[PDB]
Design a protein around this ligand. Sequence first.
Ligand SMILES: NC(=O)c1ccc[n+]([C@@H]2O[C@H](COP(=O)([O-])OP(=O)(O)OC[C@H]3O[C@@H](n4cnc5c(N)ncnc54)[C@H](O)[C@@H]3O)[C@@H](O)[C@H]2O)c1
Ligand SMILES: NC(=O)c1ccc[n+]([C@@H]2O[C@H](COP(=O)([O-])OP(=O)(O)OC[C@H]3O[C@@H](n4cnc5c(N)ncnc54)[C@H](O)[C@@H]3O)[C@@H](O)[C@H]2O)c1
Ligand SMILES: NC(=O)c1ccc[n+]([C@@H]2O[C@H](COP(=O)([O-])OP(=O)(O)OC[C@H]3O[C@@H](n4cnc5c(N)ncnc54)[C@H](O)[C@@H]3O)[C@@H](O)[C@H]2O)c1
Ligand SMILES: NC(=O)c1ccc[n+]([C@@H]2O[C@H](COP(=O)([O-])OP(=O)(O)OC[C@H]3O[C@@H](n4cnc5c(N)ncnc54)[C@H](O)[C@@H]3O)[C@@H](O)[C@H]2O)c1
Ligand SMILES: [Cl-]
Ligand SMILES: [Cl-]
Ligand SMILES: [Cl-]
Ligand SMILES: [Cl-]
Ligand SMILES: [Cl-]
Ligand SMILES: [Cl-]
Ligand SMILES: [Cl-]
Lengths: 333, 333, 333, 333
Amino acid sequence: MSKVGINGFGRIGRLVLRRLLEVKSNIDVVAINDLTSPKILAYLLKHDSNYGPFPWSVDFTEDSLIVDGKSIAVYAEKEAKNIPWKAKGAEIIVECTGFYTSAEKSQAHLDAGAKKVLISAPAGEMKTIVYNVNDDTLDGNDTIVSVASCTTNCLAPMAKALHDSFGIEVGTMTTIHAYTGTQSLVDGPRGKDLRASRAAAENIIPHTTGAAKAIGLVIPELSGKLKGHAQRVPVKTGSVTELVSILGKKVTAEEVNNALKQATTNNESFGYTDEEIVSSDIIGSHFGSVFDATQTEITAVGDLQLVKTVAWYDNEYGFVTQLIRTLEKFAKL
Amino acid sequence: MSKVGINGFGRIGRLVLRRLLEVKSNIDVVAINDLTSPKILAYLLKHDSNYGPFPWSVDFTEDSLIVDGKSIAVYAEKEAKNIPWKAKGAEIIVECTGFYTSAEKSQAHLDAGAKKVLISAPAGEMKTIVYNVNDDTLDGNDTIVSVASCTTNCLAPMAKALHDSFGIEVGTMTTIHAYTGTQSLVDGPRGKDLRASRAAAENIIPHTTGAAKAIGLVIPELSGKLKGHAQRVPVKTGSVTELVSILGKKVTAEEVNNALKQATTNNESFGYTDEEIVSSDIIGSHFGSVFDATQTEITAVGDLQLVKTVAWYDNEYGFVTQLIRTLEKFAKL
Amino acid sequence: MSKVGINGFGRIGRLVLRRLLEVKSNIDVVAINDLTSPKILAYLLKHDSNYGPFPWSVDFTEDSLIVDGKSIAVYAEKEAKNIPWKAKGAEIIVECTGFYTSAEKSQAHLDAGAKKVLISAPAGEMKTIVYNVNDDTLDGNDTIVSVASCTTNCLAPMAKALHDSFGIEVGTMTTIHAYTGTQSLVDGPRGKDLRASRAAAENIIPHTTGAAKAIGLVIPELSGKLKGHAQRVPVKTGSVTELVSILGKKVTAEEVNNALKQATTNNESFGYTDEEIVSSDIIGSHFGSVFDATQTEITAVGDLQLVKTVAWYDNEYGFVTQLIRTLEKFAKL
Amino acid sequence: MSKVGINGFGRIGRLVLRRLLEVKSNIDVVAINDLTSPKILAYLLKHDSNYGPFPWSVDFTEDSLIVDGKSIAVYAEKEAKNIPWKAKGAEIIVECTGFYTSAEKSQAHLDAGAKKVLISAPAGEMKTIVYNVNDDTLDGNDTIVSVASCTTNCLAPMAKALHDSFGIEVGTMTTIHAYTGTQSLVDGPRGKDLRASRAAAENIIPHTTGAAKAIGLVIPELSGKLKGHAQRVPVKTGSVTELVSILGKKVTAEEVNNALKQATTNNESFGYTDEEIVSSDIIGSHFGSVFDATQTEITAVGDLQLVKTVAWYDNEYGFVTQLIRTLEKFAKL
Ligand SMILES: NC(=O)c1ccc[n+]([C@@H]2O[C@H](COP(=O)([O-])OP(=O)(O)OC[C@H]3O[C@@H](n4cnc5c(N)ncnc54)[C@H](O)[C@@H]3O)[C@@H](O)[C@H]2O)c1
Ligand SMILES: NC(=O)c1ccc[n+]([C@@H]2O[C@H](COP(=O)([O-])OP(=O)(O)OC[C@H]3O[C@@H](n4cnc5c(N)ncnc54)[C@H](O)[C@@H]3O)[C@@H](O)[C@H]2O)c1
Ligand SMILES: NC(=O)c1ccc[n+]([C@@H]2O[C@H](COP(=O)([O-])OP(=O)(O)OC[C@H]3O[C@@H](n4cnc5c(N)ncnc54)[C@H](O)[C@@H]3O)[C@@H](O)[C@H]2O)c1
Ligand SMILES: NC(=O)c1ccc[n+]([C@@H]2O[C@H](COP(=O)([O-])OP(=O)(O)OC[C@H]3O[C@@H](n4cnc5c(N)ncnc54)[C@H](O)[C@@H]3O)[C@@H](O)[C@H]2O)c1
Ligand SMILES: [Cl-]
Ligand SMILES: [Cl-]
Ligand SMILES: [Cl-]
Ligand SMILES: [Cl-]
Ligand SMILES: [Cl-]
Ligand SMILES: [Cl-]
Ligand SMILES: [Cl-]
């Protein structure tokens, strides 16, 4: 299967395409569905506030985009059941709308004539892959899979290294996270969630995330052992996850950092830094997660020890590189 | 005619209530319509990212707000014609949703039992008032009235003063304007305006406005003599309007500033400053416009002269002060 | 009664005046030292990007400010020993410059003729007060004293309550903190701290703070039990401190929240909220810290329990209210 | 000579070196002077909040940078007359500190052993070059020259084009400009410029600029015929210049646009767009100026006409491409 449709040509959807082209995948994006015109999708693909001009030619007709000379159909169907995926034979749907995050809802793509769906968000109790952590759980028989959230892709590889080297007995995470499209520009209603109603670029905004809760799906041994949340803050992309853990062994910072260094060596999904970087330095990252040895902290009082480990992530592009790695493997099974 | 309803309890609508309590108007707001729950409306009213905590007590029930101890009904009817304005006797509707910006649209509130409608926005060729420029044109027969935009309330008093003192033969305006809820948080579709699709807190974004174009509604002798546009920029509120004019007389800067100063004297709508202020100093202003003498500029070669005059405005609260002066006059006709 | 001098009329030092006038304190501020002219200090006092217009009249002469009709002498001596504090009889110095944060350095004010110094920052091993936590350790003999940081003033009352109710065995803190004047507007050298060189309004920036490390000066039984750091983010003021603890007893969330609530009752320094607030809601707070029951989290596995507690603080005005409470007491001893 | 030194390794100084490497220049940067250590300079060069990772290797020793394998000497001499430019034979100094913006001040570099200085800012009455507008006025005997400001490089080619096609009789300019390091992060003294004291990322801040006033240095026929100013706003780089002119002929929008379009054809310095861009789309531009046809406006009343023309500019990288074009020519004369 080398035929993809993108449902939801948003921040993640457009970057899926940009990254497919960047790595010369033999995947062919043949169709896109959204809620707008080809003219507007083309404007948006061409001009990006976070990543700058598209590196390839972009043009449009009344029913398509022309991206680096290839035609991609554009549809505007509110309900996935009505999307004509059969029309151009879209086999694998990259589900990036946020509105189909369960096997029940993403079934509508299959009903509509697609074979597989890769959901770009947590999608409940289904297979949930962080590339280079648990992508060997994938088989030929899988039809609807999740690559979880940006935060899950940041946390999982750090948690996994810690769990493998030291054991994690219990832990809590806080991500200091760039604001996203689910939040508000000015204070006003945003469904039921009171905090999401507040002006995102003018506030620190606590926010729920399931990355830690649902880590069970990626790292089965940590199931139920982690909790966490986010503080959404006014940067446009680039985020950082802090994990505070009780480990199964007494450790030093040096030891922790060496264990992480090993886990990131020749690891295309998981990077390492001992440089004094800030969030803008992670924009454009090709990793799902970048461990930052400069922020490691061990608080010890006798036999008790809290270990804080910190990893950066580009919640847009960095996450997308993990989505594509997983897509490329999903496509070959 | 002292009982009011607010349709659209947004940036403008919530501030309408705040300003009304602040000046202890004899006007009572007896009902609110929006699209959400009293809980959410009360949360937004209590906590404001731009003006801080509401200065009175705020609580709610399943169908009401309780503000400063007074009960205000809350309805959630998306079509104005369905709002049960008669239940609490709402007579004047302050229309702040953005969705009824015409006589044809806003007459739905009359169908729904109200007596008059004041529209918080330009609304085509109906009676349109900038308080202390043309509120003397209001009469007993006016049933649907507009107060034009924030930008109109800024531009008009400056243009009026220039018109009366010197003549404006032609002019062009640029307002450098705070972002608003019609813009986008992250890059993505925002109706059909391509620029409006771009991340508002991360861009200078050219934006069309009608303030100059429709100035004839407020200053009839300047009908068709002005054009202009906006540059939307990343401040939360607070804006500034520049007008470049060919006047009907040769002038000096001191002479323009003195004329403006005279027009702002005992003028509750139109302030003056010669202080080196910046936009956050205008937040919370009780004027619709504050002329800034430090920015006046006369550019002349022989008989060819360009005059640049600049005024600040808090496009949320300052505009709201104008809306409320207009409302209090409208209610006593 | 007591005559005060302010050294460093910056963000903090200006708000010290504002808050003293706001509470109608008996303290008279008779002198200010900074590095600039009365005209510039008057401009800055009058117009504040975070708190708006000064609530009292502000004027200047060539050597003073006139504030609400009262004269305050202005000096510009970069070395504190050259400040003529005796000329106006300034007895208590509020040291707000950043450059005299030790007993040895602040001694220069005593040499220059002041009697006491209160330093608006950590200042090594001196008496270090968080009002309503340990202000009872002050006595008539103290002549140089610290009120620690904003973060300490947020952290200490929350750590005190947890300590008093449950014991803290070990803990780690992260504060997501507004940017301040120690940081950089654009990427450029900023002393020796590499991360402080980076554009503050455009980045999440890891940053060291001694709040947790030196907490033993305020709560001696927690000496050595806490560590932490900051992430500096693009909000202009308003900050939040998370603390992850192992406590000496097993607990529920409700139980933690009730203990904190009791601790905040009739506590003018330490507030409580169960509302879904965001950082701009803390701006202008009259508390040093506001505990947020909505963010409390207990992660538990077997007999292991991590407890996350979170408190907001207005690192500018809120801290200042603490500084003023301490100042009022220190001046009467 | 082809050996260059940079004085002021700031936003402009560092981008000078990046651009020199990017276009594979002949020029050999042999020395840098600033105020700090090689370590700090290396960190700043390597990590850039606006343009991302340096595309070449960066290391340092105690007295040098090593960039793409080449050693560059670092000095820390706050007075230019003391910079030891003869040690590595720097012949042309790119003066980017902002402290030597006159002939008399930059003479210090010649006293210090250099032959020529190119000042990255206006510097009074000396040859002032906007590349592809008046670079042919440079000759073999010029030793101190200016490239003016970012704004000048944006305005001049638009003005030149309008002047050549229609005549400019008189005109006034407003640039909506990214904040820069001359401004303040938080409200605090900034020399004598009151508006520069105010928090740059939280305000619209009127600011003077000589772009229009000194335009006669670049286009002598326009001397005295233009004036203008800036509004500094909260975007990190990327700016826009609006010019309102009385022209020598009556025109249509299409006529202005086609004339501009012709002046931009095969012009490496002056670009054209008819796309609906916003400021972030100009970041990384290799033009000094990009004329934007979508914003052209003609306001006409009988006999009279005002013509608004607008061009974007990356006040950092864009301007730097102009500086480098000029430097390459200067070095070969
Ligand atoms: N932004 C991030 O940092 C991030 C990171 C990882 C995962 N995700 C997830 O990826 C998904 C997309 O997030 P995003 O930031 O790209 O959101 P977005 O809001 O930028 O994009 C959503 C796109 O889907 C379209 N859309 C909405 N409803 C639709 C429908 N019914 N049919 C077709 N198109 C529809 C919108 O028009 C838009 O173009 C979400 O599930 C999100 O949780 C986002
Ligand atoms: N924000 C400004 O600077 C400004 C200044 C002057 C005028 N205005 C105008 O005032 C009006 C409101 O602007 P705002 O900035 O407060 O917008 P907003 O988006 O903050 O508020 C609109 C409110 O109306 C509600 N709403 C939307 N459709 C509705 C419907 N059918 N029925 C009931 N409620 C509905 C929304 O839920 C929201 O609470 C617009 O016409 C706008 O142009 C805005
Ligand atoms: N969030 C906060 O801003 C915050 C919170 C708590 C404590 N503090 C502490 O308060 C102090 C001041 O912080 P700020 O944010 O007000 O800084 P600031 O930079 O806004 O103000 C410092 C003032 O000191 C002046 N100054 C510098 N050197 C001087 C000298 N040698 N003599 C006299 N004046 C001098 C400056 O001109 C400026 O007006 C620091 O110790 C800081 O850590 C700050
Ligand atoms: N930033 C822009 O948008 C822009 C555009 C065009 C021109 N310019 C001009 O270029 C010049 C530099 O601007 P910038 O934005 O790079 O400034 P900046 O503040 O980023 O850089 C100035 C550099 O000079 C160093 N410095 C200061 N005084 C010094 C001295 N006496 N000796 C040696 N080094 C010293 C600083 O440490 C810093 O690294 C200014 O003249 C400015 O007007 C700036
Ligand atoms: Cl469906
Ligand atoms: Cl959780
Ligand atoms: Cl209706
Ligand atoms: Cl117009
Ligand atoms: Cl506008
Ligand atoms: Cl620590
Ligand atoms: Cl000028």
